[PDB]
């Protein structure tokens, strides 16, 4: 079984989980309306929000607090993208293979992300990316320990304290393994599959951040962006 | 330099 | 009478602005929508919209385009808020004293540029003015000479050729005037209360920096501006 | 610096 410490742990991290994602997602109605680079204007919203979110749940982990601002900026700005593939898996349909944002205005499938500015050399490695995710079945408690690990991953440009986030990371990663041991049944296999999505998430931030430098070098384009998706999918150290 | 980051950040 | 070359500059002039001011403002359903400072994300979309309208329009005045980049950024940056106040008045309602975008959801009451961050020590004098524009009685060829001599006026901070610029100016101010003597019964004292108006403007200009400087510098607020916004009335050179 | 005023006015 688990100790204390770590299920105080699973506890935080739930919390914080639940109060920075809106399965209503009422808030969707302010974001600038969708349009079938018609999308453009609706996903900054989207995603603007979705970075605020990830701020939040960021500030609620463990340790991560702890940190010095820069280490913070510094996680924040490598893994935000990929936090938020991983947090919109659950509103992700294998039926649809759309994401289904309790409205259909608000289902984005494929083709609305193609009029975003980006291309299937995105797109598909995204969209099989949640299918294999959504095919974990997750507890979730093993979804934010995943994201709380993909968040405090040293090995990211820019963090100044290396040692100190890869013992966070650690700690995660520790009450993860036992977590999926304990009360996961059939989960021989799991915790392995999960690190190999961290693997693919890598690969999935490089060809997004190829894709937003082609936009962002486009005043045009880039002028539909919001303020804090340029300042965190900016270069700026 | 990270002028939103840093407040929300608090 | 007036001369083809003046006769040239209204024609140009008011073509310009039918070209950038849509009377259906059906584009304002694209904005964040607004809500009843709730009201900031949608008067900075509106305000957005209109700066990109305001350089359409400048880029269509005679000579406008002849000017150095700088130059055109500089005449920008001064005049964008005193256009868009001026260009306004064309929704304004004496009635309602309010601005009426061809439906309720935008009809823009003061109280609603109040939850946008703004005190009555910018929107009373604001709404006088309106008022008293509106009393005018402006002929549409009236109305855009305005804002084109406006637009180019020399003395901003920032330009460069301030000989080119007045010449422009000056060329605007003669037709205008003649325009006043031999088209509008009645408008002996006409082209002296327009000239009063661009002085209102400079006021309404200074109060408008004065707040929109106490909104950039909180980011919780400034981050809801748009990236056009924050370039355009931010400071630099 | 202007990037968006440098475009725009083409
Ligand atoms: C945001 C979430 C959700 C849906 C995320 C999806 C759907 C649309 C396309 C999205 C945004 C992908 C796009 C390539 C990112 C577009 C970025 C930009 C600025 C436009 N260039 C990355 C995640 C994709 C909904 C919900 O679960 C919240 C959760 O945070
Ligand atoms: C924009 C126009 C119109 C209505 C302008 C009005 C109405 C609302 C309050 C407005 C925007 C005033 C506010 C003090 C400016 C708010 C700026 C910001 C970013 C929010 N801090 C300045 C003009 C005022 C509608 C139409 O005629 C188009 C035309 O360009």
């Given at each position: 079984?688990?100790?204390?410490?770590?299920?105080?742990?699973?506890?935080?991290?739930?919390?914080?989980?639940?109060?920075?994602?809106?399965?209503?997602?009422?808030?969707?109605?302010?974001?600038?309306?969708?349009?079938?680079?018609?999308?453009?204007?609706?996903?900054?919203?989207?995603v603007?929000?979705?970075?605020?979110?990830?701020?939040?749940?960021?500030?609620?982990?463990?340790?991560?607090?702890?940190?010095?601002?820069?280490?913070?900026?510094?996680?924040?700005?490598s893994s935000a993208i990929e936090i938020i593939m991983?947090?919109?898996?659950?509103?992700?349909?294998?039926?649809?293979?759309?994401?289904?944002?309790?409205?259909?205005?608000?289902?984005?499938?494929?083709?609305?992300?193609?009029?975003?500015?980006?291309?299937?050399?995105?797109?598909?490695?995204?969209?099989?990316?949640?299918?294999?995710?959504?095919?974990?079945?997750?507890?979730?408690?093993?979804?934010?320990?995943?994201?709380?690990?993909?968040?405090?991953?040293?090995?990211?440009?820019?963090?100044?304290?290396?040692?100190?986030?890869?013992?966070?990371?650690?700690?995660?990663?520790?009450?993860?393994?036992?977590?999926?041991?304990?009360?996961?049944?059939?989960?021989?296999?799991?915790?392995?599959?999960?690190?190999?999505?961290?693997?693919?998430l890598?690969?999935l931030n490089?060809?997004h951040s190829?894709?937003y430098?082609?936009?962002?070098?486009?005043?045009?384009?880039?002028?539909?962006?919001?303020?804090?998706?340029?300042?965190v999918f900016?270069?700026?150290? | 330099?990270?002028?939103?980051?840093?407040?929300?950040?608090?």
């Amino acid at each position: 079984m688990l100790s204390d410490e770590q299920m105080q742990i699973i506890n935080s991290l739930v919390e914080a989980h639940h109060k920075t994602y809106d399965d209503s997602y009422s808030d969707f109605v302010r974001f600038r309306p969708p349009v079938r680079l018609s999308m453009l204007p609706h996903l900054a919203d989207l995603v603007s929000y979705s970075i605020q979110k990830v701020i939040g749940f960021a500030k609620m982990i463990p340790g991560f607090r702890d940190l010095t601002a820069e280490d913070q900026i510094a996680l924040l700005k490598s893994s935000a993208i990929e936090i938020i593939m991983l947090r919109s898996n659950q509103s992700f349909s294998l039926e649809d293979m759309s994401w289904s944002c309790g409205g259909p205005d608000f289902k984005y499938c494929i083709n609305d992300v193609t009029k975003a500015g980006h291309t299937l050399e995105l797109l598909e490695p995204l969209v099989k990316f949640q299918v294999g995710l959504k095919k974990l079945k997750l507890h979730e408690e093993e979804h934010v320990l995943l994201m709380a690990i993909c968040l405090l991953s040293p090995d990211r440009p820019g963090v100044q304290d290396h040692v100190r986030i890869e013992a966070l990371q650690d700690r995660l990663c520790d009450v993860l393994q036992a977590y999926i041991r304990i009360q996961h049944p059939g989960g021989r296999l799991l915790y392995a599959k999960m690190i190999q999505k961290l693997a693919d998430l890598r690969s999935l931030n490089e060809e997004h951040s190829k894709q937003y430098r082609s936009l962002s070098f486009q005043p045009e384009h880039s002028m539909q962006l919001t303020p804090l998706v340029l300042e965190v999918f900016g270069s700026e150290v | 330099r990270h002028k939103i980051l840093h407040r929300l950040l608090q």
